[PDB]
Design a protein around this motif. Structure first.
Motif, mmCIF file in Angstrom:
data_model
loop_
_atom_site.group_PDB
_atom_site.id
_atom_site.type_symbol
_atom_site.label_atom_id
_atom_site.label_comp_id
_atom_site.label_asym_id
_atom_site.label_seq_id
_atom_site.Cartn_x
_atom_site.Cartn_y
_atom_site.Cartn_z
ATOM 1 N N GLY A 34 -4.260 -29.681 -8.964
ATOM 2 C CA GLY A 34 -3.436 -29.602 -10.152
ATOM 3 C C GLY A 34 -3.601 -28.307 -10.917
ATOM 4 O O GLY A 34 -2.962 -28.103 -11.954
ATOM 5 N N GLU A 35 -4.456 -27.420 -10.416
ATOM 6 C CA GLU A 35 -4.660 -26.109 -11.007
ATOM 7 C C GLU A 35 -4.486 -25.043 -9.936
ATOM 8 O O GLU A 35 -4.705 -25.296 -8.749
ATOM 9 C CB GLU A 35 -6.043 -25.994 -11.637
ATOM 10 N N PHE A 36 -4.104 -23.847 -10.367
ATOM 11 C CA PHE A 36 -3.860 -22.749 -9.453
ATOM 12 C C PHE A 36 -5.114 -21.890 -9.368
ATOM 13 O O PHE A 36 -6.181 -22.253 -9.873
ATOM 14 C CB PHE A 36 -2.671 -21.905 -9.913
ATOM 15 N N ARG A 37 -4.994 -20.737 -8.723
ATOM 16 C CA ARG A 37 -6.094 -19.801 -8.575
ATOM 17 C C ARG A 37 -5.826 -18.559 -9.411
ATOM 18 O O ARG A 37 -4.751 -18.385 -9.989
ATOM 19 C CB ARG A 37 -6.311 -19.427 -7.106
ATOM 20 N N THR A 38 -6.831 -17.695 -9.464
ATOM 21 C CA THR A 38 -6.790 -16.531 -10.336
ATOM 22 C C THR A 38 -5.519 -15.732 -10.103
ATOM 23 O O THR A 38 -5.311 -15.171 -9.024
ATOM 24 C CB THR A 38 -8.018 -15.657 -10.105
ATOM 25 N N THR A 39 -4.677 -15.678 -11.128
ATOM 26 C CA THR A 39 -3.395 -14.993 -11.071
ATOM 27 C C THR A 39 -3.494 -13.677 -11.823
ATOM 28 O O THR A 39 -3.947 -13.650 -12.972
ATOM 29 C CB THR A 39 -2.298 -15.860 -11.679
ATOM 30 N N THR A 40 -3.075 -12.589 -11.178
ATOM 31 C CA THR A 40 -3.186 -11.272 -11.781
ATOM 32 C C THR A 40 -1.985 -10.429 -11.394
ATOM 33 O O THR A 40 -1.354 -10.651 -10.356
ATOM 34 C CB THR A 40 -4.471 -10.568 -11.354
ATOM 35 N N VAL A 41 -1.681 -9.446 -12.244
ATOM 36 C CA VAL A 41 -0.571 -8.531 -12.033
ATOM 37 C C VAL A 41 -1.011 -7.105 -12.334
ATOM 38 O O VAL A 41 -2.076 -6.854 -12.896
ATOM 39 C CB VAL A 41 0.652 -8.885 -12.898
ATOM 40 N N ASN A 42 -0.147 -6.172 -11.948
ATOM 41 C CA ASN A 42 -0.316 -4.753 -12.236
ATOM 42 C C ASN A 42 1.069 -4.131 -12.280
ATOM 43 O O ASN A 42 1.835 -4.245 -11.319
ATOM 44 C CB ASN A 42 -1.200 -4.065 -11.201
ATOM 45 N N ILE A 43 1.384 -3.487 -13.397
ATOM 46 C CA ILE A 43 2.706 -2.941 -13.661
ATOM 47 C C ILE A 43 2.663 -1.421 -13.609
ATOM 48 O O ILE A 43 1.669 -0.790 -13.985
ATOM 49 C CB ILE A 43 3.226 -3.418 -15.030
ATOM 50 N N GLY A 44 3.758 -0.834 -13.132
ATOM 51 C CA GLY A 44 3.915 0.606 -13.146
ATOM 52 C C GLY A 44 2.976 1.363 -12.243
ATOM 53 O O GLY A 44 2.730 2.549 -12.471
ATOM 54 N N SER A 45 2.442 0.709 -11.217
ATOM 55 C CA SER A 45 1.517 1.352 -10.298
ATOM 56 C C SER A 45 2.179 2.433 -9.456
ATOM 57 O O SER A 45 1.467 3.194 -8.794
ATOM 58 C CB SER A 45 0.885 0.304 -9.385
ATOM 59 N N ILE A 46 3.507 2.536 -9.471
ATOM 60 C CA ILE A 46 4.237 3.348 -8.505
ATOM 61 C C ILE A 46 5.292 4.168 -9.233
ATOM 62 O O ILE A 46 6.066 3.632 -10.033
ATOM 63 C CB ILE A 46 4.902 2.473 -7.424
ATOM 64 N N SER A 47 5.320 5.468 -8.947
ATOM 65 C CA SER A 47 6.211 6.402 -9.621
ATOM 66 C C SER A 47 7.524 6.599 -8.877
ATOM 67 O O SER A 47 8.589 6.638 -9.501
ATOM 68 C CB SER A 47 5.514 7.752 -9.782
ATOM 69 N N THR A 48 7.465 6.723 -7.550
ATOM 70 C CA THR A 48 8.667 6.948 -6.757
ATOM 71 C C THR A 48 9.729 5.886 -6.986
ATOM 72 O O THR A 48 10.893 6.104 -6.635
ATOM 73 C CB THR A 48 8.314 6.996 -5.274
ATOM 74 N N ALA A 49 9.362 4.750 -7.563
ATOM 75 C CA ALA A 49 10.278 3.645 -7.766
ATOM 76 C C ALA A 49 10.624 3.498 -9.238
ATOM 77 O O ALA A 49 9.845 3.866 -10.121
ATOM 78 C CB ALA A 49 9.680 2.338 -7.258
ATOM 79 N N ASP A 50 11.809 2.945 -9.485
ATOM 80 C CA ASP A 50 12.230 2.663 -10.850
ATOM 81 C C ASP A 50 11.376 1.560 -11.455
ATOM 82 O O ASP A 50 10.811 1.726 -12.541
ATOM 83 C CB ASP A 50 13.704 2.282 -10.868
ATOM 84 N N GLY A 51 11.265 0.433 -10.769
ATOM 85 C CA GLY A 51 10.380 -0.643 -11.191
ATOM 86 C C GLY A 51 9.390 -1.004 -10.103
ATOM 87 O O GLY A 51 9.731 -1.003 -8.921
ATOM 88 N N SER A 52 8.162 -1.312 -10.511
ATOM 89 C CA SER A 52 7.099 -1.650 -9.580
ATOM 90 C C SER A 52 6.250 -2.765 -10.159
ATOM 91 O O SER A 52 5.948 -2.764 -11.355
ATOM 92 C CB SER A 52 6.214 -0.440 -9.284
ATOM 93 N N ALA A 53 5.857 -3.710 -9.309
ATOM 94 C CA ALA A 53 5.005 -4.801 -9.760
ATOM 95 C C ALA A 53 4.151 -5.332 -8.623
ATOM 96 O O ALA A 53 4.677 -5.685 -7.565
ATOM 97 C CB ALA A 53 5.835 -5.939 -10.343
#
Lengths: 241, 237, 289, 183, 252, 286, 265, 287
Positions: free
Chosen positions: G22-41
């Protein structure tokens, strides 16, 4: 532009019942088991026959009764004035492969080379009309150079119909006009046809004419080819001893 | 989930559970049924059917007269086959199932290493299974256990092999069939029924053979009109 | 250094330099061989409507009552005593599969290959596993045929120790219809080398040793004075074949003796090729008769 | 303790010898893996160096072993299996073994019958004999009365109990299947 | 139209080509300089071996799907699939490719076959899969290094590691060899080059190059310069692998 | 393929400065060059180097230029690795080598100084020339790349693009004006088009025109691309083996010298032929 | 003996990793890691990982809707994710996931295609959102959707103009503009064992040995965008309302996370 | 999967029954099987079943930029698919030879014979033209395809109707089937193939062969014809040696056969129009 002047002549400067000088040769490539070359006008076919040899990756297709004919077709990009790409894999080269295969499986007399590939390959360097027949004939010369038994010269050519007459060995011009063109390949000795392709609209009573005309053109092609082959055999034997 | 006795002549559909009366008396689950605990799950649409042994202890037996085309290798069934190849000692024959069955060069009546049988690829056979199971390729044989081919072995030649539905056979092989009896009066013949929907026939001429095959492949629903039509044709052959 | 480019010159056909006008009977498919009462057919023909019809391009040969054809290019059909040279292609649990210029894959059964020295007892699984470490895939064997199967294949063996596996040497692949059927294909020439002339089109050229069965690899160097000779022989054979003439001891010896003035490399240029071949041919013809 | 790398030298031939995971160049040894090295010493005083990636250090099911396996495919000739537990230590590198027809019971009778001994999808344990040469085909044997099947699922989904030597039954309902029961 | 992907537009050109400006030029810098490198092995779980390398705007993954059954004929194989993510580079390219991906794949295979020893992996094919998330300069070299790390991580045997390095040429009047450049220094360039070697035994394994021009002596200086760069880079990778092995020792 | 002892023989031969063809380590073999084989093309050529036969067609078509370079045209390369070479090629097995060779040929011509493309522009951003080169393999006997390059150069030299005036008009109507002077067709310079050179390393000695039997005996091969001046456009390395840092330099120097010689010989030959005229009869495949 | 080993934990109301069904695992993100692209996640759920790069290009619309800027997703499950995939064209799972992402984009209506038309009939944007899996330990749809949304918030586009004299458009890569998104669809996964046992965020093995799977996307304003129910042992609304509740909870959690991130930049 | 092998018994029996001029089901040699033409609800769908062989045909339209060589006349796109329900062997991307030959033959037959008017379907010469594609699908495989495929393509292309369009200058206006009545196509003549099968190197010839007869035949002669006796294509496959008189006779047969098939097709279209003019979304014709 025109096809049949009122006098009877064509554009190239030949009557309906004749054809263009085929200039051929047998023995182009030595790294093979059989090779040939032919120019039936501006056309330039080139055949190769890697002989009856072993099947690899058997993949359970090695016929035990007879041999396995594998013929591949190819029309170079620079063949036509209009450049094209993907000469192999197309839906037309594979049809040509089927055609050549069902002809030579008829002629090549496979009952003597069971469980063995006869690999035929055809490349068309230049095309100016009559593109299938040149290939048939080049592959025939090749087979012969490879000492592969075969019932008879399987000689092929094309005919057409214009102004109530029959033309022999069409070119690209009258092939583009859209008129009926009937290509075929027969075995002269018996008078039997090994292949009969045809593509355009025309009445029925106008069939016997173009049919016998193509047949006679193929007979003439037979004469020319056999003269070439006899020169070749004679020279080779003389050199042997 | 009710009255196994009241739907012994009705159309049951998969999913349906039916339960049976009783301390109890052993019974048997037919081919198209399956057991869930003490209940009978149905696995194939069918006109349900029952039978009891001449005794009173055997209990009974239930099944579904399902019609279909595909065959499944079963044990103790007489089956036509088509030799597909030979590997050394054993040669593989097709049956019409998941995978090809296997024979042995010394299973035919009276054969040994110094006496091998005449079986050529493409030859057809009338054998029976001795190991028919979901987990192992089925092996068949053309000889009763005692050691005599009571009609088994190679069929022969000069006949017509066609294919029909399995229920059609399951019906024709009944001792109370009318078509296959009436046919024994018009012109002679000799035929093999294979429980895999595959039939073999022979007669003197060929017109008769063709008429016969058409009758058989149609006799499931023939009309009296077509019935007497083909009968008259046979009478005129 | 030296590089050279040159346009292609047109052939000179008809071989008129000879002027023979052969006394043979050439044919081509569809041609009708003599149709008579019960003439037996051989390789290179078939029958149609009570008519003996050729099947291949070449000269016809009528032995007392047998009609056969002798084509000018084929792949080695298997005889029963012909020696042979072969490059291995596969190693199956039971045997070796070898490639000759044949219409199938020749076969050397594990029972056939001779053993180190004369240690002959029988073949077991240990031999089945040495089956690889001794005769590697791609190696060469100089054998002689044992028999021909009904499917066309050729089972070959090794009668003695003169046969077996080959040293380092060099090899050539020619057509099999360009080696005269005669005896002693195994030659050891005075030039300083030795040659093996397969009944197929595989010729082998190895320096001749001094001791006089391949169970050891003498991967030693070879004196320049014994590699230059081999290379010259190789190019001379290529010359002979390029001009379509037969091939055997005297032919190669005389092309050799002809190609001493012309250096070891300039005797593939078609002019030199042709003049050497003409000299050799003329001298054979005149000396023999 | 020291972790090594596929290029760094480790020792002269005069100061050790290659055991595994190494190679030799002029007068030196050179590692071949990312892992931990170890130089064992014999009573001879000449060390044997080796390199190991102890993630899956090493296992070897030898002849006189007792190894479990799962029956996947069968035939009238033999039944093939996959190796799971070599002793009691599992091995994610599931090796593939075989059980012959005659090599099924100590009595060696030809009367044995696979379909009445084994079925696809049951666990057994057996003793390996031959490692194999080309495909490392383990050949396992059950010529013993405390060998063979231990757990076996029923017609559809029930686990059965080893009643007798060649009989097994499901506890919920009653049906006598036939196997080469162990023990 | 491809029937295994979503129906998009027939053609689509980017906006940059519709821009109006003279893009910024780098200028000057220390030619014998190297970018800051972050290399770590052991990132991915579901793979026998994986590695990740970042050098500037360069961001590359590599995974090694290990031995998968498939002497000199029973000699191992390794087939490498290089692949740049469609969201790398100024322009977008459909995932398939078919022009330069395969060239760089051939490069990887030709530079890895030497280092790896395949006699000990017979009848087997190692599936190496590289992925280029972002292009920011020397790409093929990063990919070589990452594949080497991933292999050495999965524990396949070798003779030595593979270190790559990319160079460019300044089109100025005094052309100097620019070491480990950026996508700008590489698109505003005359010539490009890529070396890859095994530094212990000092042997090249696969190199590559191209030029609006050049000359023997210049190319030779470029070569030696790339060799020195790879030498100076090697220790980072060494430490990375040691670190991953320590983490493994920690896990159990 | 071939055995091990043959490889020993060949490598000691090279180390001794002899070869089965009795030639040294810096000696090609007679390469039969021909030009103007096929007629329907705007250029053509053929090469027969020992036992490798290459054909090359060149078609000058009209197409849209490339947005990043509207001021000039472009070369495209296709490579039909016809199965006629070795039967192990088919509709899918030759794509690998064809792609490799095509990528090389591109890499030879991202040079901007080889073929002056500005001369191939009619109206920027509106119309331009396009050189579709089509290589066609017919045998494989080694030294493949050098022959392909020589053929490309002979075909370029033998290319004759017609002059066209593309005149604009309002309401979107365009007109092309030909010059009815097939003798007045333009010719592109090839004084910079480079030749490939394949140095295969055998033992501790490098070799040129590495015949198959010697390619199988080798471990590395350095491809160089040289122009008649002495520069080195491309420098690639191919082989499942290693290669020392010092031998690279010797390979490069040798490539330089061999390129000088090769380009001299080719230029002389093709000027000769252009001089002769239709009197040559164009012997091809006959 | 995997299934049995797993039922033991299931009946102990746990899992072999330490998660309480009933619970998930460690959820993490990172934004803007990439320049060649308009949006990156970059997104990662413990071992599972996904990365979205969204590029922006120009294109001509259809004839049925000139004022529609295309949004084209494509999922990539390369062989380096797991060994169950092979070098070559896309398999089946990639294609199914692609259609799922597209159905989401189209039904949730997170974005107005009309907000991408510059000059109707002539130009319109095309957003190529390319997602790539890097560790398929399980539950790839949640990660894909979440990374898509993250990058699709990160994306800021340039501004273009039209010149009637030149009849062409010019860009201003200096000034830019974010991308408005109205709904924030989050996806919640479920694995249904024999009859009644629903586990949340199932990893690899748990999906290999499961009778069925389920996925549910739950917009912020108490609505659903998709109920992906491919086969399974069956369900009644009572085993479904609970999943919807848990989906709302997960929505809250991940939206808070994403807000914290976009604010930590 | 794979096709069940053919027993020598059936082969010999068939060859003998041919020698004696006896088919299996009970028909002669110069006879087809009862061909049924059934229509759908959407203009352009037709299911034609001859005996056991059912084939489906759909016709669809689009507007697209034409190709430069022909900027005046439109386009036409054939495609035939062999659905796995036709037979086991018809896995995707495996029986490619049959696909290739059938598709090339059909393209040739219909396109190059100029059966329809590729010119009539022009709207804007250079910018927008029609594009008519026709997808045939093989549902059951019992014997003769080419005939079925062709009858289907023809019934469709004669039972199809375009969304009407109005035009002024460059202003093009498409409309819906509810706003106006779709317009039909423009056919000049309806060709339909005819299949002959050769047995024993050329001695015997059959019409409309079943599947077994196709397995024990050596050669196949396809002949396209019209009601006006105009050869459109003829093809020989199977590697067989025929003669002249054989093709002449086969043509004199195809004449009558095509006349009759054409009469039927026309009757079918008439009946379908009558039905829709009375309430009903179907149309049925029987040989």
């Amino acid at each position: 532009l025109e096809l049949l002047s009122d006098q009877g002549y064509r554009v190239d400067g030949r009557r309906a019942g004749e054809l263009r000088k085929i200039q051929a040769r047998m023995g182009v490539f030595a790294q093979a088991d059989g090779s040939a070359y032919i120019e039936q006008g501006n056309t330039k076919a080139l055949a190769v026959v890697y002989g009856p040899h072993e099947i690899r990756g058997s993949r359970a297709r090695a016929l035990p009764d007879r041999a396995l004919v594998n013929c591949q077709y190819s029309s170079a990009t620079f063949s036509t004035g209009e450049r094209k790409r993907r000469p192999h894999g197309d839906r037309k080269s594979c049809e040509m492969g089927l055609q050549l295969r069902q002809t030579f499986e008829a002629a090549i007399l496979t009952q003597l080379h069971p469980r063995s590939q006869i690999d035929i390959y055809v490349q068309v360097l230049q095309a100016d009309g009559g593109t299938y027949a040149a290939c048939v004939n080049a592959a025939t010369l090749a087979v012969l150079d490879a000492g592969i038994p075969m019932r008879d010269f399987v000689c092929a050519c094309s005919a057409g119909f214009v102004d109530g007459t029959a033309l022999a060995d069409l070119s690209h011009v009258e092939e583009a006009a859209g008129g009926p063109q009937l290509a075929l390949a027969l075995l002269p000795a018996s008078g039997q046809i090994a292949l009969l392709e045809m593509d355009a609209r025309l009445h029925e009573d106008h069939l016997e004419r173009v049919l016998e005309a193509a047949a006679q053109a193929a007979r003439d092609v037979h004469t020319l080819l056999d003269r070439v082959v006899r020169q070749h055999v004679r020279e080779a034997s003389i050199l042997l001893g | 989930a009710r009255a196994a006795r009241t739907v012994l002549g009705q159309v049951v559909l998969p999913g349906e559970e039916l339960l049976l009366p009783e301390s109890r008396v052993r019974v048997v689950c037919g081919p198209g049924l399956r057991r869930c605990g003490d209940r009978l799950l149905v696995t194939k649409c069918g006109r349900l059917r029952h039978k009891e042994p001449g005794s009173g202890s055997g209990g009974g037996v239930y099944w579904v007269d399902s019609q279909q085309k595909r065959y499944v290798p079963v044990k103790g069934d007489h089956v036509i086959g088509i030799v597909t190849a030979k590997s050394g000692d054993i040669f593989k024959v097709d049956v019409g199932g998941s995978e090809p069955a296997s024979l042995s060069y010394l299973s035919f009546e009276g054969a040994t290493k110094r006496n091998r049988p005449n079986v050529q690829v493409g030859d057809l056979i009338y054998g029976q299974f001795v190991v028919a199971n979901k987990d192992m390729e089925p092996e068949m044989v053309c000889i009763d256990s005692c050691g005599r081919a009571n009609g088994m072995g190679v069929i022969g030649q000069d006949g017509l092999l066609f294919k029909v539905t399995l229920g059609l056979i399951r019906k024709l092989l009944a001792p109370d069939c009318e078509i296959i009896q009436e046919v024994g009066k018009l012109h002679p013949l000799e035929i093999v029924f294979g429980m895999n929907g595959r039939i073999w026939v022979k007669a003197k001429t060929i017109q008769q053979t063709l008429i016969l095959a058409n009758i058989l492949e149609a006799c499931e629903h023939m009309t009296s009109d077509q019935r007497k039509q083909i009968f008259s044709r046979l009478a005129e052959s | 250094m030296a590089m050279e480019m040159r346009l292609p010159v047109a052939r000179k056909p008809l071989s008129e330099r000879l002027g023979r006008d052969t006394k043979k009977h050439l044919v081509v498919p569809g041609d009708t061989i003599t149709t008579d009462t019960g003439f037996m057919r051989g390789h290179g023909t078939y029958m149609g409507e009570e008519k003996l019809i050729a099947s291949v391009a070449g000269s016809v040969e009528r032995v007392n009552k047998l009609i056969c054809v002798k084509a000018l290019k084929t792949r080695y059909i298997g005889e029963v005593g012909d020696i042979v040279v072969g490059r291995i292609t596969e190693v199956q649990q039971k045997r070796w599969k070898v490639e000759t210029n044949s219409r199938l894959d020749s076969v050397l059964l594990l029972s056939s290959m001779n053993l180190p020295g004369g240690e002959l007892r029988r073949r077991s699984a240990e031999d089945e596993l040495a089956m690889r470490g001794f005769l590697q895939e791609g190696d060469l064997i100089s054998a002689e045929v044992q028999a021909v199967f009904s499917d066309g294949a050729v089972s070959l063996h090794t009668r003695s120790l003169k046969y077996g596996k080959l040293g380092q040497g060099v090899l050539v692949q020619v057509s099999p219809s360009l080696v005269k059927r005669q005896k002693t294909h195994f030659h050891d020439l005075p030039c300083g080398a030795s040659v093996i002339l397969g009944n197929n089109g595989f010729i082998w050229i190895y320096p001749t040793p001094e001791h006089k069965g391949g169970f050891i690899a003498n991967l030693e160097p070879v004196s320049l004075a014994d590699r230059e000779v081999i290379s010259r022989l190789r190019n001379c054979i290529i010359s002979l074949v390029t001009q379509r003439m037969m091939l055997y001891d005297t032919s190669i010896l005389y092309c050799y003796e002809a190609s001493l003035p012309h250096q070891i490399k300039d005797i593939l240029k078609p002019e030199i090729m042709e003049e050497i071949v003409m000299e050799t041919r003329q001298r054979l013809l005149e000396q023999e008769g | 303790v020291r972790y090594c790398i596929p290029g760094e030298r480790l020792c002269n031939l005069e100061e050790g010898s290659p055991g595994s995971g190494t190679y030799t160049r002029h007068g030196y040894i050179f590692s071949s893996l990312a892992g931990c090295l170890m130089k064992s010493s014999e009573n001879g005083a000449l060390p044997v160096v080796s390199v190991v990636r102890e993630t899956e250090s090493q296992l070897l099911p030898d002849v006189g072993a007792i190894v479990t396996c799962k029956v996947s495919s069968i035939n009238s000739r033999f039944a093939k299996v996959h190796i799971l537990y070599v002793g009691s230590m599992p091995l994610k590198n599931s090796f593939r073994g075989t059980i012959r027809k005659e090599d099924v019971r100590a009595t060696e009778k030809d009367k044995v019958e696979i379909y009445k001994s084994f079925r696809p999808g049951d666990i057994v344990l057996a003793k390996v004999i031959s490692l194999g040469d080309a495909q490392s085909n383990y050949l396992l044997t059950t010529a013993e009365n405390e060998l063979g099947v231990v757990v076996a699922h029923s017609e559809s989904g029930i686990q059965m109990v080893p009643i007798s030597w060649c009989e097994m039954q499901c506890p919920k309902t009653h049906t006598k299947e036939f196997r080469k029961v162990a023990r | 139209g491809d029937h295994r992907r979503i129906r998009g537009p027939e053609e689509s050109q980017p906006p940059q080509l519709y821009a109006a400006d003279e893009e910024e030029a780098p200028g000057t810098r220390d030619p014998t300089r190297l970018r800051p490198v972050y290399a770590r092995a052991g990132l991915l779980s579901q793979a026998k071996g994986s590695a990740y390398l970042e050098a500037g705007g360069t961001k590359v993954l590599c995974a090694v799907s290990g031995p998968r059954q498939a002497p000199a004929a029973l000699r191992g194989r390794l087939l490498c699939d290089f692949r740049r993510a469609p969201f790398a580079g100024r322009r977008r390219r459909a995932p398939p490719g078919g022009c330069e991906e395969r060239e760089l794949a051939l490069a990887l295979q030709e530079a890895l076959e030497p280092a790896v020893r395949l006699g000990r992996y017979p009848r087997a094919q190692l599936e190496v899969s590289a992925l280029l998330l972002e292009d920011g300069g020397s790409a093929l070299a990063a990919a070589l290094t990452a594949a080497a790390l991933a292999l050495a991580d999965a524990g396949v045997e070798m003779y030595d590691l593979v270190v790559g390095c990319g160079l460019s040429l300044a089109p100025g009047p005094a052309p100097t060899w620019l070491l480990d450049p950026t996508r700008l220094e590489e698109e505003r360039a005359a010539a490009g080059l890529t070396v890859a070697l095994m530094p212990v035994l000092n042997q090249v394994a696969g190199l590559l190059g191209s030029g609006e021009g050049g000359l023997t002596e210049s190319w030779a200086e470029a070569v030696r310069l790339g060799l020195e760069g790879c030498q100076r880079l090697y220790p980072v990778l060494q430490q990375s692998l040691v670190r991953a092995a320590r983490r493994r020792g920690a896990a159990a | 393929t071939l055995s091990e002892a043959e490889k020993v023989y060949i490598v000691h031969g090279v180390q001794e400065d002899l070869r089965v063809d009795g030639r040294g380590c810096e000696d090609y073999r007679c390469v039969e060059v021909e030009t103007d084989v096929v007629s329907n093309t705007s250029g053509s050529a053929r090469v027969k180097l020992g036992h490798t036969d290459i054909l090359v067609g060149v078609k000058a078509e009209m197409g849209t230029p490339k947005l990043e370079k509207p001021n000039e045209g472009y070369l495209e390369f296709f490579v039909d690795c016809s199965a006629s070479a070795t039967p192990e090629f088919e509709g899918r097995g030759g794509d690998d080598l064809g792609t490799e060779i095509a990528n090389t040929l591109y890499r030879i011509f991202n040079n901007k100084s080889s073929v002056d493309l500005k001369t191939l522009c009619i109206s920027p951003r509106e119309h331009c020339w396009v050189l579709y080169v089509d290589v066609l393999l017919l045998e494989c006997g080694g030294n493949l790349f050098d022959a392909i390059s020589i053929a490309v150069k002979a075909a370029l030299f033998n290319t004759r693009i017609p002059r066209v005036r593309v005149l604009e008009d309002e309401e979107g109507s365009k007109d092309i004006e030909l010059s009815d002077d097939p003798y007045d067709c333009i010719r592109l310079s090839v004084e910079n088009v480079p030749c490939i050179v394949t140095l295969c390393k055998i033992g501790y000695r490098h070799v040129v025109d590495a015949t198959l039997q010697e390619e199988a005996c080798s471990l590395a091969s350095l491809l160089v691309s040289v122009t008649s001046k002495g520069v080195v456009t491309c420098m690639r390395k191919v082989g499942k083996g290693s290669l020392d840092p010092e031998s690279i330099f010797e390979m490069m120097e040798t490539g330089k010298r061999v390129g000088k010689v090769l380009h001299a010989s080719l230029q002389s030959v093709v000027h000769k032929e252009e001089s002769l005229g239709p009197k040559r009869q164009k012997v091809g495949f006959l | 003996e995997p299934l049995e080993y797993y039922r033991r934990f299931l009946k102990e109301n746990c899992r072999p990793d330490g998660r309480e069904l009933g619970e998930f695992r460690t959820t993490t993100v990172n934004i803007g890691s990439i320049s060649t692209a308009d949006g990156s996640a970059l997104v990662k759920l413990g071992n599972t990982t996904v990365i979205c790069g969204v590029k922006a290009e120009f294109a001509a619309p259809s004839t049925d809707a000139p004022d529609k800027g295309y949004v084209v997703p494509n999922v990539d499950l390369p062989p380096l994710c797991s060994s169950r995939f092979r070098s070559g064209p896309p398999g089946e799972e990639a294609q199914v996931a692609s259609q799922f992402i597209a159905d989401v984009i189209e039904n949730s209506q997170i974005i107005q295609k009309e907000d991408l038309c510059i000059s109707p009939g002539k130009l319109v944007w095309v957003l190529y959102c390319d997602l790539i899996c890097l560790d398929y330990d399980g539950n790839i749809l949640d990660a894909c959707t979440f990374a898509l949304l993250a990058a699709l918030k990160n994306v800021q586009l340039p501004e273009v103009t039209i010149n009637e004299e030149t009849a062409l458009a010019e860009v201003n890569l200096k000034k830019k503009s974010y991308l408005n998104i109205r709904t924030h669809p989050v996806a919640t996964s479920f694995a249904v064992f024999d009859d009644t046992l629903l586990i949340v965020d199932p990893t690899g093995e748990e999906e290999h040995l499961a009778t069925g799977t389920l996925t549910i996307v739950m917009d912020e304003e108490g609505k659903l965008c998709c109920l992906h129910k491919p086969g399974g042992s069956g369900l009644t609304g009572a085993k479904l309302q609970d999943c919807m509740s848990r989906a709302v909870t997960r929505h809250k959690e991940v939206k808070k996370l994403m807000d914290e991130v976009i604010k930590s930049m | 999967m794979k096709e069940t092998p053919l027993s020598n018994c059936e082969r010999r029996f068939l060859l003998r029954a041919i020698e004696e001029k006896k088919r299996l089901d009970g028909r002669q040699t110069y006879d087809y099987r009862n061909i049924r033409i059934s229509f759908g609800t959407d203009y352009g769908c037709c299911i034609v079943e001859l005996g056991k062989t059912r084939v489906l045909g759909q016709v669809s339209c689009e507007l697209v930029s034409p190709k430069l060589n022909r900027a005046t006349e439109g386009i036409l796109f054939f495609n035939l698919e062999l659905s796995q329900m036709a037979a086991p062997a018809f896995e995707p991307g495996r029986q490619s030879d049959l696909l290739v030959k059938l598709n090339r033959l059909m393209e040739r037959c219909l396109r190059n014979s100029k059966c329809i008017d590729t010119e009539s379907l022009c709207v804007v010469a250079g910018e927008k033209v029609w594009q008519i594609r026709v997808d045939l699908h093989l549902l059951n495989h019992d014997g003769n395809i080419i005939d079925a495929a062709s009858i289907a393509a023809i019934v469709a292309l004669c039972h199809f109707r375009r969304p009407d369009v109005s035009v002024q200058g460059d202003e093009v206006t498409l409309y819906t089937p509810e706003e106006r009545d779709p317009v039909p196509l423009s056919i000049h003549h309806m060709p339909i193939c005819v299949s002959f099968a050769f047995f024993q190197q050329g001695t015997y010839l059959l019409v409309d062969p079943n599947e077994r007869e196709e397995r024990v035949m050596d050669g196949l002669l396809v002949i396209a014809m019209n009601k006006h006796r105009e050869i459109c294509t003829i093809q020989s496959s199977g590697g067989i040696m025929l003669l002249k008189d054989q093709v002449l006779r086969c043509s004199k047969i195809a004449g009558v056969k095509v006349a009759e098939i054409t009469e039927l097709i026309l009757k079918a279209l008439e009946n379908d129009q009558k039905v829709r003019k009375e309430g009903g979304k179907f149309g049925f014709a029987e040989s």
